[PDB]
Amino acid sequence: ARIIYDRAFLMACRGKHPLQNRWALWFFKNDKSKTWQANLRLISKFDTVEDFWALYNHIQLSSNLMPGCDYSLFKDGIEPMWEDEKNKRGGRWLITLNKQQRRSDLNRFWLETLLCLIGESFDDYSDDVCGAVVNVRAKGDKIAIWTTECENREAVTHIGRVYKERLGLPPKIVIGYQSHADTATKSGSTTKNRFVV
Amino acid sequence: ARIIYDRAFLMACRGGGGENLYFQGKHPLQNRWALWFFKNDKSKTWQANLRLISKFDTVEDFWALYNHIQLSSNLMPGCDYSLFKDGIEPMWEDEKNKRGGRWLITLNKQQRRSDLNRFWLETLLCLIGESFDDYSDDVCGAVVNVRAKGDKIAIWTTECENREAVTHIGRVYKERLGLPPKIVIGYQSHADTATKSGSTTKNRFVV
Ligand SMILES: C[C@@H](O)c1ccc(-c2ccccc2F)cc1
Numbered sequence: 338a339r340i341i342y343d344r345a346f347l348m349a350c351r352g353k354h355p356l357q358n359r360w361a362l363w364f365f366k367n368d369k370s371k372t373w374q375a376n377l378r379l380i381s382k383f384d385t386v387e388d389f390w391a392l393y394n395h396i397q398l399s400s401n402l403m404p405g406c407d408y409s410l411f412k413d414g415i416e417p418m419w420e421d422e423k424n425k426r427g428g429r430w431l432i433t434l435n436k437q438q439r440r441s442d443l444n445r446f447w448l449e450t451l452l453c454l455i456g457e458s459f460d461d462y463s464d465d466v467c468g469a470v471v472n473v474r475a476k477g478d479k480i481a482i483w484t485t486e487c488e489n490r491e492a493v494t495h496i497g498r499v500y501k502e503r504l505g506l507p508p509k510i511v512i513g514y515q516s517h518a519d520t521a522t523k524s525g526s527t528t529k530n531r532f533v534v
Numbered sequence: 535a536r537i538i539y540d541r542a543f544l545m546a547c548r549g550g551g552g553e554n555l556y557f558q559g560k561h562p563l564q565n566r567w568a569l570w571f572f573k574n575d576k577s578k579t580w581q582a583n584l585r586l587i588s589k590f591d592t593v594e595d596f597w598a599l600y601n602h603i604q605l606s607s608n609l610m611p612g613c614d615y616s617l618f619k620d621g622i623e624p625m626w627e628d629e630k631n632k633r634g635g636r637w638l639i640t641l642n643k644q645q646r647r648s649d650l651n652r653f654w655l656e657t658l659l660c661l662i663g664e665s666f667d668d669y670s671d672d673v674c675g676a677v678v679n680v681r682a683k684g685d686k687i688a689i690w691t692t693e694c695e696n697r698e699a700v701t702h703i704g705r706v707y708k709e710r711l712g713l714p715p716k717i718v719i720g721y722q723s724h725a726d727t728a729t730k731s732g733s734t735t736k737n738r739f740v741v
């Protein structure tokens with residue numbers, strides 16, 4: 338049966354409990370002097386609650402929020418690039434933060450996102466999750482959960498609705514899901530949402 | 535009490551026939567086990583080349599995974615497959631491996647065709663069936679290194695200094711492999727394997 342942990346349980350393990358999946362933490366800086374492949378660093382992998390927290394504390398203590406960086410947590414064997422076989426037919430639920438929310442909501446929202454991933458918070462639809470990405474940017478931070486198949490409406494919408502609930506966002510505040518094939522095309526200031534919740 | 539299966543029993547479960555009525559029809563294993571894959575691609579970090587394939591905790595789920603990997607795959611040199619108890623990384627620096635070692639068998643090039651598949655399977659059955667009595671708790675896992683010069687199969691154990699456990703595991707393993715008494719197997723501590731000190735690594739024990 339699926340290994341599922343709620344928020345209370347994961348927090349109680351913080352200072353081994355196996356995860357349903359093994360996960361890989363990646364770092365990317367968009368340094369145009371280097372190829373995208375050189376810019377992409379695997380930091381670490383883990384598959385227990387306790388090893389997640391040890392890595393979290395180490396990255397949080399030893400940390401940077403340099404704009405232009407990205408951190409990504411993805412299931413083992415999935416590259417954090419939309420061209421991966423497990424991402425190319427998929428998309429993302431995107432949370433856009435305003436500049437003030439860098440100080441108030443970024444750390445909390447990112448952590449809540451990470452807990453939804455490792456705790457398998459979306460029931461059978463947790464299998465559709467590929468990973469999550471935070472883009473640290475001067476103009477506004479972005480957090481997203483990447484899923485494998487943009488045509489799996491039931492899976493995608495369940496993920497969005499639960500994610501929204503776990504973030505504690507007001508029902509007024511709507512989140513969009515965008516297919517990666519649409520995000521990849523620059524067609525103006527906005528990318529169309531395939532779904533909203 | 536420990537869940538122990540002999541070879542005959544495990545082989546009799548090979549077959550998807552099971553209905554698994556009530557989710558209670560499969561034979562539980564004493565431990566949950568994780569199958570890992572590693573390619574030593576020097577363009578990537580060691581972390582990037584180590585992949586978790588799957589985990590299982592019944593006899594029937596072992597066989598479904600075995601059949602799938604056996605049908606869908608062959609053996610590239612430079613690859614390693616490892617089966618380890620859940621929560622032990624197949625790296626000697628893991629807390630459960632750093633004070634331990636391995637019982638090693640090395641197969642020559644011809645034995646890729648004749649003995650590799652059989653020996654690897656017999657190794658896997660010793661692990662999942664808890665074939666070493668209370669000393670099965672000292673087992674961490676097993677590793678096959680597929681190599682052009684000669685393949686290696688090993689059972690990794692947790693603690694060097696547990697002489698009685700280590701030697702019992704070795705004797706039983708050698709018996710389960712059906713090796714001639716002439717053919718000796720060595721146990722090497724991982725701290726000694728890690729240091730390259732010449733053509734050989736010292737054996738702490740031999741059976
Ligand atoms: C932005 C900075 O505070 C940060 C970024 C990533 C992690 C992290 C650590 C372990 C596993 C997944 C993660 F995303 C932690 C902290």
Ligand SMILES: C[C@H](O)c1ccc(-c2ccccc2F)cc1
Nearest residue numbers: 569599600603604607608615617
């Ligand atoms: C490809 C090679 O012949 C191979 C490698 C690993 C297994 C395996 C299957 C199930 C559980 C653990 C395993 F190591 C079987 C075959």
